[PDB]
Scaffold this active site. Structure first.
Site, PDB file in Angstrom:
ATOM      1  N   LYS A  39       0.839  -1.200   0.000  1.00 59.47           N
ATOM      2  CA  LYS A  39       0.000   0.000   0.000  1.00 59.47           C
ATOM      3  C   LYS A  39       0.878   1.255   0.000  1.00 59.47           C
ATOM      4  O   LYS A  39       1.907   1.299   0.675  1.00 59.47           O
ATOM      5  CB  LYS A  39      -0.940  -0.008   1.215  1.00 59.47           C
ATOM      6  N   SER A 117      -9.668   1.700   2.675  1.00 59.81           N
ATOM      7  CA  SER A 117      -8.757   2.465   1.824  1.00 59.81           C
ATOM      8  C   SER A 117      -7.675   1.632   1.128  1.00 59.81           C
ATOM      9  O   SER A 117      -6.978   2.143   0.248  1.00 59.81           O
ATOM     10  CB  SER A 117      -8.093   3.580   2.641  1.00 59.81           C
ATOM     11  N   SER A 141     -10.100  -0.716   6.916  1.00 62.84           N
ATOM     12  CA  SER A 141      -9.525  -0.451   5.601  1.00 62.84           C
ATOM     13  C   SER A 141      -8.748  -1.613   4.978  1.00 62.84           C
ATOM     14  O   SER A 141      -8.319  -1.519   3.834  1.00 62.84           O
ATOM     15  CB  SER A 141      -8.679   0.831   5.615  1.00 62.84           C
TER      16      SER A 141
END
Lengths: 446, 285, 125
Positions: A39, A117, A141
């Site tokens: 990420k 996210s 997330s």
């Protein structure tokens, strides 16, 4: 096939907008030859770390995050950095300077949301581009996008995995998470990363890790709870058939299933949206363009407001959070809302402690010998909608109702699919520190 | 007329390394190349984290013991928020809600301190550990050196026990000697290793604080000026007001959103830290 | 308070339990701040006033606050000490870590800045 794997990568990237940057040579110890995506709020020496933000559009970290370093030492190939909601704020995967990530469970023209996210992370696993992905989970997330990609998404106990090099959203809630289709790969990665880090002052101490290990007992049989407060949302068509099918499987394996009420979970969203924006405002105070990142070409001040020209490049949702967070921190609101939220959070943790057999080493609970070993809870109550519908609905006025409580209590929680290529999932939840029980259970039933 | 005066004294600790990073705490800041003694954390790089230097705890222990202060069972660091070029995090770490120690005092005598009173004790309100900020050089563009950012400070706040100006001078003098004797600071006002703010009020009128006083001579003069200036008055001195100093006269001059740091552990010292450090104390005068 | 019920005896007991008359969290969860308050907030947030839609911020914030203020009506209901030897042992084992950039001059601290003057960071008046 090396050339064919690269072609697949290029195709899925152009269609689904998964990575913010890709290894210049894609696909070229214990995890030797495994391929990971990371990420893009987790810093790396070899890639930019943008947080999907104009603020850090071309930021290059001098150092790798601890989790990145541990994976490289284990021989893992990092394929690239994945797209995300800006600075980890968002649940739909739509807020990014690179544009939204599209869910690969559907044709790309359908424009279905991936969830967020850790949107890119989940997509990269769903597409079979990487063996596993690292994301971050602050209020769901990791678990929510994993649910929408029909893959495993594990959020470990708070403090097990290092946050050194993990760009801060809400530090008391932020947790590094792991996404994969294979439970064996996920356990190996967790074992590789489940390490004390002296660089991280919130890292779970070696002493406490040993205390936790020493508290494990034979459970004969495992006792599983179904949470009343999470059992009455309107769920997608087909959910209950799948859910009850799974529950019947467990009962036929000799597990004992119990009804359980944990009333404090109902108030978790108001608590979360008091504490989290406050911490976010605080953690984003450093961004000014002076030492790194984007900087306005002409002005370091405007309207008598220092750094405003540069800071105007934050995303709209980020700015919304900063403003709310600063409200929550001001003297009058602090002594009212913030302090109350902190106490309710403590209360919530006490309620979990009261129903779990496993002792909580952080609160020194004794554990309840008449209690439970695991909770099974839905991951989401919605199917992924279109990106258009999401943004439309967001401009009007909860997708984290199921995931926020485990974040607030720092509990290990793994979202698992109920059916192949179906954006429906269940969370297996354990007491703080009881990650091995969660993982072994999931391994056992797959 | 009665003078009710108190002091706020910031003191740079001479620990080997900085407060929340192990980067060098330099004693030669004036000659050092700028931004040389700076870790990833000192520059507030994304993803960096504070780790408390335990030597700062030891130093704060020695001072608390010397003053007879009560060490807090639990202390913590809080974030004081504001934007400035020499504050890279966008906040300062300081012990606002729960200071390291409270109480304590310093004894002054005519015999030893050239005081009119035979004996006079100055009570201590509290003792706090906090981060220093960077240095700004104004040349319009301002140059920022973060070598000094994250240097450990101890802030000592006295009670408003000062009545005479001779008391203020004698206290600063003895406090300087004490920190040097304990080997926790150079106590030098010239280098900025020690900084003294003043708060005062005459005859229970509004409290005024004097800032930016570079040397002991300027502190004494600002106090004397502000005392006589206030005497002459009187609607303007009804509410508190922070003033400054210009060598000749005193001139006039934000929600910090204090939040306990969500990452740093509480300072929770066992009783044996008290007795342990006590044995390592030098003979006091 | 939290409570655990009797073990489910069969799957239909679970189906009935899941069908009980109990409100959802959605059902459970159902005067803006002044313009001067929003301007104050924008300043503390280091965000520009020019171009800011004040009324829109007022509205959004009003909705946000009404949600979190639900906490207003919710009532409410011995850790690891650092000892002397650990204090001194901790101190003795403190050192500069290359992985933290703690050795003086080990990296270019101004190297990531878009602008600088020699070895200084710069801020414009």
């Amino acid at each position: 096939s090396l050339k064919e794997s690269i072609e697949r990568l290029s195709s899925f990237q152009s269609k689904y907008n998964i990575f913010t940057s890709i290894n210049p040579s894609p696909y070229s110890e214990t995890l030797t030859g495994c391929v990971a995506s990371i990420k893009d709020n987790i810093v790396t020496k070899d890639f930019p770390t943008t947080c999907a933000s104009h603020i850090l559009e071309n930021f290059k970290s001098p150092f790798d995050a601890t989790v990145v370093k541990l994976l490289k030492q284990a021989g893992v190939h990092i394929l690239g950095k994945t797209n995300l909601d800006e600075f980890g704020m968002g649940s739909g995967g739509v807020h990014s300077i690179r544009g939204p990530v599209i869910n690969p469970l559907y044709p790309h023209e359908d424009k279905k949301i991936m969830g967020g996210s850790s949107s890119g992370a989940a997509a990269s696993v769903a597409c079979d581009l990487v063996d596993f992905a690292l994301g971050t989970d602050t209020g769901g997330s990791v678990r929510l996008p994993a649910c929408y990609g029909s893959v495993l998404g594990f959020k470990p106990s708070y403090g097990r995995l290092s946050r050194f090099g993990v760009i801060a959203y809400s530090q008391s809630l932020d947790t590094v998470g792991i996404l994969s289709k294979k439970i064996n790969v996920l356990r190996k990665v967790f074992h590789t990363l489940d390490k004390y880090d002296m660089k991280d002052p919130t890292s779970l101490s070696v002493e406490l890790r040993e205390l936790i290990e020493g508290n494990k007992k034979v459970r004969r049989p495992l006792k599983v709870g179904i949470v009343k407060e999470f059992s009455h949302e309107s769920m997608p068509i087909g959910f209950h058939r799948l859910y009850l099918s799974l529950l019947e499987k467990l009962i036929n394996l000799g597990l004992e299933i119990y009804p359980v009420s944990i009333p404090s979970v109902k108030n978790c969203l108001p608590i979360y949206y008091t504490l989290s924006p406050a911490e976010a405002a605080s953690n984003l105070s450093r961004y000014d363009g002076i030492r790194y990142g984007y900087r306005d070409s002409e002005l370091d001040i405007k309207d008598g407001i220092l750094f405003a020209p540069t800071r105007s490049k934050f995303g709209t949702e980020v700015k919304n959070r900063i403003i709310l967070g600063n409200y929550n921190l001001c003297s009058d609101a602090f002594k009212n809302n913030f302090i109350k939220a902190e106490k309710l959070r403590v209360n919530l943790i006490d309620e979990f402690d009261g129903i779990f057999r496993f002792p909580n080493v952080l609160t020194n609970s004794k554990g309840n010998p008449d209690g439970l070993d695991l909770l099974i809870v839905p991951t989401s109550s919605k199917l992924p909608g279109s990106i258009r519908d999401f943004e439309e609905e967001e401009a009007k006025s909860i997708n984290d109702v199921f995931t926020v409580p485990m974040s607030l209590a720092g509990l290990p929680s793994l979202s698992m699919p109920l059916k192949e290529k179906t954006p429906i999932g269940l969370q297996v939840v354990g007491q703080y520190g009881d990650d091995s029980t969660v993982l072994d259970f999931v391994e056992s039933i797959s | 007329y009665a003078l009710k005066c108190g002091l706020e004294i910031h003191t740079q600790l001479n620990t080997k390394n900085k407060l929340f990073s192990q980067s060098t705490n330099s004693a030669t800041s004036l000659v050092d190349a700028p931004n040389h003694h700076t870790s990833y954390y000192d520059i507030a790089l994304p993803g960096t984290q504070p780790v408390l230097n335990l030597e700062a705890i030891l130093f704060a222990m020695k001072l608390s013991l010397a003053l007879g202060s009560q060490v807090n069972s639990i202390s913590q660091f809080d974030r004081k928020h504001y934007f400035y070029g020499d504050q890279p995090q966008g906040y300062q770490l300081t012990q606002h809600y729960r200071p390291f120690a409270r109480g304590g005092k310093i004894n002054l005598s005519k015999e030893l301190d050239d005081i009119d009173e035979s004996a006079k004790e100055i009570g201590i309100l509290q003792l706090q550990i906090e981060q220093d900020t960077g240095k700004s050089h104004y040349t319009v563009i301002t140059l920022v050196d973060l070598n000094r950012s994250n240097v450990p400070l101890i802030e000592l706040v006295t009670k408003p026990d000062f009545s005479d100006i001779k008391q203020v001078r004698a206290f600063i003098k003895k406090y300087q000697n004490l920190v040097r004797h304990l080997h926790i600071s150079s106590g030098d006002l010239e280098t900025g290793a020690m900084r003294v703010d003043v708060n005062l009020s005459i005859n229970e009128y509004a409290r005024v604080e004097l800032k930016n006083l570079p040397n002991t001579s300027s502190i004494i003069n600002a106090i004397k000026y502000e005392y006589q200036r206030q005497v002459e008055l009187t609607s303007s001195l009804m509410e508190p007001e922070t003033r400054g100093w210009t060598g000749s006269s005193t001139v006039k001059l934000i929600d910090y959103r204090y939040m306990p740091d969500p990452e740093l552990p509480y300072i929770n010292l066992a009783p044996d830290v008290i007795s342990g450090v006590r044995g390592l104390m030098p003979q006091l005068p | 308070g939290a409570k655990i019920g009797k073990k489910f005896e069969n799957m239909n007991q679970i189906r009935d339990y899941l069908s009980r008359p109990v409100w959802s969290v959605h059902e459970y969860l159902g005067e803006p701040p002044s313009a001067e308050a929003v301007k104050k907030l924008l300043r503390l947030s280091g965000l520009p006033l020019e171009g800011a839609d004040i009324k829109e911020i007022q509205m959004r914030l009003a909705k946000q606050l009404s949600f979190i203020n639900k906490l207003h009506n919710i009532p409410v209901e011995n850790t690891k000490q650092l000892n002397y030897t650990k204090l001194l042992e901790g101190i003795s084992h403190q050192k500069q870590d290359a992985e933290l950039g703690e050795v003086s001059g080990s990296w270019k601290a101004t190297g990531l800045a878009a602008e600088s003057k020699n070895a200084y960071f710069v801020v414009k008046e």
